[PDB]
Amino acid sequence: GAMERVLKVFHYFENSSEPTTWASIIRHGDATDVRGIIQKIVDCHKVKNVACYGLRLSHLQSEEVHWLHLDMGVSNVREKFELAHPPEEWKYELRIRYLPKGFLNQFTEDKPTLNFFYQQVKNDYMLEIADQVDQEIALKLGCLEIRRSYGEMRGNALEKKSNYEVLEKDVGLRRFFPKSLLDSVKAKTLRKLIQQTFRQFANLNREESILKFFEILSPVYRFDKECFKCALGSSWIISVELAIGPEEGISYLTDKGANPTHLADFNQVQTIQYSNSEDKDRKGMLQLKIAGAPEPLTVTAPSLTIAENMADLIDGYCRLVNGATQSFIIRPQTDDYAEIIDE
Secondary structure, three states: OOOOOEEEEEOOOOOOOOHHHOEEEEEEOOOOEHHHHHHHHHHHOOOOOHHHEEEEEEEOOOOOEEEEOOOOEHHHHHHHHHOOOOHHHEEEEEEEOOOOOOHHHHHOOOHHHHHHHHHHHHHHHHHHOOOOOOHHHHHHHHHHHHHHHOOOOOOOHHHOHHHHHHHHHHHOHHHOOOHHHHHOOOHHHHHHHHHHHHHOOOOOOHHHHHHHHHHHHOOOOOOOOEEEEEEEOOOOOEEEEEEEEOOOEEEEEOOOOOOEEEEEOHHHEEEEEEEOOOOOOOOEEEEEEEOOOOOOEEEEEOOHHHHHHHHHHHHHHHHHHHOOOOOOEEOOOOOOOEEEEEO
16 A cells, blocks of 8 residues: 655754754655745744755765755655665754854844754754863853753752752753763862853843854854865866855855855856766766856866755755745756644
């Protein structure tokens, strides 16, 4: 018998449990597209900035990731990739990928989205640099999350050892601070540090804690831009590193450390077009037609996978910046219903 199509999609909409376990089980049809899955999940959480969310497919046993375009079919993608690796090795994750200029101010008017982005960046921070950052930053971020998780608790409740005790023994400080910090500092000293650091933020509400978290994290962790190693040029190919994000639209890094050089703004992108490889090679080519520029911006990526992930990013930004729901990618020169059946 023809089994029913069911999909598990992790996300960052806070539930009663651990961040990495939050996920939605979706029952869908044969013609359901990535767009419908995204829309159903965000609409269920009353999200306003729907054009910021994308769906990322990660291989658990490696680092290869595939951003899924809004127009692709859910059954199609699962078909294609299950051929490469078994379903158990795949992870579908809903994430915010396209940020509008002044996204933080804008997200404050969309609480569900502000919290989502916060959980997403927090989780990336905890996994990528929590153990590398300096004690001070890690300590403040950990306290900010304590302040945010317990918005009903009084400012000096942490002063009581009995209360600190519960977090230290029952909840566990790993929920707010990195391992390095919890194992490189004396337990009794750690407590005083936390108590003191918390005082600075005891007056902050949930929103103000999130905003302060970003303010403090921003300086040492770039979460507002994606970077890709590729090459620009039609005739002459020059390898560079592209920095794509709200602040500097599409730009490139001259050299590690130096400010990125602007190439084009998202609103100037008129068309995005794919290309394969005229020879044995497998590189992927992206051609961007920019308003005001007679010559298209040609980009070459190390593989088709990266090329597609880049096209998805630029297209998402094109949709976002223009307020369009349709794709700017052009051809190379009931039954789709989806429902949440569990959380």
